[PDB]
């Protein structure tokens, strides 16, 4: 269909993928660092969600270089994804409006 809606859907699928690889790689990055808490997968996936929506309570966060790099990727992927949706909703609204007139 319309490009904007395809880019949106694509971004959402990709986000779900970044959340899962992000959870996997965070645990992999953080185990081995004394004091780290981002070390079991169920809570890491939750950590990935709250990082992507940029909510960041946090209750958990990375302390190593690679966990932080993985964190930045999750952030960016979520901020970009949510931004692509807004943008598509604007495209849709601009079109229907030019019609309503």
């Amino acid at each position: 269909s319309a490009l904007h809606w395809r880019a949106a859907g694509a971004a959402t699928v990709l986000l779900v993928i970044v959340l899962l690889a992000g959870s996997y790689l965070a645990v992999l990055a953080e185990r081995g660092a004394p004091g780290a808490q981002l070390i079991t997968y169920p809570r890491a996936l939750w950590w990935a969600c709250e990082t992507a929506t940029t909510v960041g309570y946090x209750d958990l966060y990375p302390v190593t270089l690679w966990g932080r790099l993985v964190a930045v990727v999750v952030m960016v992927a979520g901020i970009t994804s949510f931004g692509l949706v807004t943008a598509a909703l604007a495209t849709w609204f601009v079109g229907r409006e030019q019609e309503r007139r």
């Binding site: 953080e30 185990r31 081995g32 660092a33 004394p34 004091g35 780290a36 808490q37 070390i39 079991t40």
Partner: protein, 106 residues
């Protein structure tokens, strides 16, 4: 790293009685504590996970409770097969660590 203190190291109870093993963490670990049973010459056996969640195949007599730094593994009406050593283990922070162990004597 997280120190898990199990005291007393030996607990003596009368057949059928209520027993409670204690595990104290050096800092707060939510409910990330797990309990194992190791009988003489045996390998450890998971009894309770995440402080209070039951495991399949484990008698209903076994229960756990606590959150934060203080944890208890309880046995309702102890029996002979419960004679063993009991360990707690935390997974809240790296690295995982084990408590020193409590022996149950009847």
């Amino acid at each position: 790293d997280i120190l898990l203190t199990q005291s007393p190291a030996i607990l003596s109870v009368s057949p059928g009685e209520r027993v409670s093993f204690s595990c104290r963490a050096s800092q707060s670990i939510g409910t990330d504590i797990h309990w194992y049973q190791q009988r003489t010459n045996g390998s450890p056996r998971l009894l309770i996970k995440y402080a209070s969640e039951s495991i399949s195949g484990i008698p209903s007599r076994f229960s756990g409770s606590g959150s934060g730094t203080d944890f208890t593994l309880s046995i309702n009406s102890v029996e002979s097969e419960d004679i063993a050593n009991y360990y707690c283990q935390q997974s809240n922070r790296w690295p995982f660590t084990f408590g020193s162990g409590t022996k149950l004597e009847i």
